[model samples]
Target chain A: SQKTRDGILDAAERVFLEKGVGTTAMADLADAAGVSRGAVYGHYKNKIEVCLAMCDRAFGQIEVPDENARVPALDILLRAGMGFLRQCCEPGSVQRVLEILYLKCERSDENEPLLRRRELLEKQGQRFGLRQIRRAVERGELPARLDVELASIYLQSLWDGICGTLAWTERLRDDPWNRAERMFRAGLDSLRSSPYLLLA
Target chain B: SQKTRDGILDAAERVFLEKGVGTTAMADLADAAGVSRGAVYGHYKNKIEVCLAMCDRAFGQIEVPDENARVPALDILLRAGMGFLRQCCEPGSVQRVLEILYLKCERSDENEPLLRRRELLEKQGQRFGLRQIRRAVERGELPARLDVELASIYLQSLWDGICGTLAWTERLRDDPWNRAERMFRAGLDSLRSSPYLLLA
Candidate 1:
């Protein structure tokens, strides 16, 4: 069935992640997926296209969690972001993304399509955050007169800030989820009047 | 002779900024400086070493103006940071750094020395900021109970935050340096209050 297409792509994702886009071969992906090489080729025209598909799949999993589902906006962003970071910083996943990014960098190519996927992910996260912030503003969670654009910028920048730090340093990659959580809380507290924020 | 060294390194910096670390060759650097290839390598080990020298040279040029040099410790940190940023972001120096950084990520094998240079440069900058922050605290420029440690954390985070924004997006690359300055100011303003101070 065409619906089985996702399963093949999922296996391809893991193989691409493990062996890297440039190094991974069609035969390797097929063997890993327990499918025929023809089936793998049917799903993806080539390894690069498979990688693009895998990136789309990886990005699909990066949605922001619902704060109203359990906690407030701040907590939701922090928690879900931590979850995403855990996956991204995972051994296989981190190496895969790093290799692909470097390949693009070396060729002086644009990572824009991947970056745009990230933008879409963040835009959605920011919209959810804005709604949460707005609700908080109404409930006196934040100052009503504050510049919402600036507020939005600050919130999203905090996410990028911590993520970038972790990406840059290997020491950071260890227990980055904890650091991300701590940094997020501290950052959120800075937005409040108090200098300290207790962890939830 | 020192001026010639400076001129050659400056040209190397410009070439490194444009062609990046690995793609750039010694001969191109010489052409850029209007010198012989032997002349460029006479003062430096190789392209990577030359880039390290350039990074150090650029770091020296990122100083804050004098008048704002002695504002309150935190304010001093923020203002000087924005000031350094204004200088660095001119003609997309930060963008060039990110390109170098992306190269650094791929060639981690070769980048250890360069990375150490960057870390030392950052450590030096942060220490300089810490000294100023502590001086302000002693002078009662901030709340008597202000936490210099947390202040440093927030302060350092702001630089990384702003750099991430600039580094992450090329579109924002075209935005005014003042955009980053505003974010820096905004982050610092949010942290104003008694914060945790490191022991003297």
Candidate 2:
């Protein structure tokens, strides 16, 4: 049943995040899912397959901005960034998968496919950021003379730094999301006024 | 004798960064160092000790601003950030040790000491950033009303994001340091003007 499959995937996320991908076993997954080992085997060939399916399930749910919103590109960018930040920092499938991909998964022959999936997502994110920065330039929300490549990197670097700091440090232990939103807006402000970001 | 020890430490950095701390054995460190296993054992008790020593050597070399530089606190902050950025991204002992500490080190009984070291460094770095932001406010380089805590997170986040991007992505394939510098300065610019970062 569809419900059984969902249950197994959610359980896979929990086990994988807790034990890490290398150490997690099918029996463990079965136990966590409250299903028989045969039941898990029937759904997926192995733990890797289960993990891949779990990733797909989570990645598929990410929301893209609606084209008809008619908002400025920078606003769309801020909303998308904050939404993804919440998904990553908060407890959910996105957060679980990210932990699995980044911290829990080991880099080895068996985990190559999983690592590749992570790399692909990173590339996709970079391209998306570029598109938004370009669009903002078109809308005159950013300076026309802005070096789009630098501007894109500038935004991305800030986002990565904020995410990492919030995740790793005790700084902003309370109300991290509110603080994260302000940093994002401040980053956008840099693109608007920083002469160093402009092409000479 | 000291030269042989240095050789082993340098090789440990290489192997540790490449194979990860848990997977890289003392024998591998000896081989990479072009020294006998006895020589390695003579200098360091184990791989963990070698890693700790390597961290100390690299961290001790980190450049901090002189107390009497007669520059704005923000300028000192930017210089310190860019200096640390180069150390992290450029291929050298600092870079290698950081890679080992961050990406290669694992959480295990044996790695607990190394992880604690990493955590300590993180705390120290945050405190340093906070100090700089506060000084900038004192000097009026940043707004008197700036939220110093958020401002520190803001700069640190941008630094982390830019460092991660430059290290992992091909986005800034050319002249990364120059671009990273701009992002850092722009981040400072945001602190000066962004209303979101200001105190109510």
Candidate with maximal TM-score? 2
Name the lDDT of candidate 2: 0.85
Tens digit of per-residue lDDT, candidate 1, span B40-129: 778887878777776766665566546344455656666677776655545645535535654433455777777677678677786877
Segments in model 1 whose C-alpha atoms lie over 4 Å from true places: A1-11, A18-25, A31-35, A56-64, A67-87, A90-116, A170-182, A189-200, B1-7, B41-52, B64-70, B92-112, B132-151, B168-182, B189-200
DockQ of each model vs. true complex: 0.28, 0.79
Interface root-mean-square deviation, each candidate: 5.6, 1.0
Docking class of 1: acceptable
> Would you list the clashing residue pairs of candidate 2?
A157-B161, A157-B162, A161-B157, A161-B161
Model 2 stretches astray by more than 4 angstroms: A22-28, A108-113, B1-3, B22-47, B109-113
What DockQ does model 1 achieve? 0.28
Winner by DockQ: 2
- Measured by lDDT, the strongest candidate is 2
Candidate 1: deviation at residue B6, Å?
Answer: 4.4
RMSD of each: 5.6, 2.7
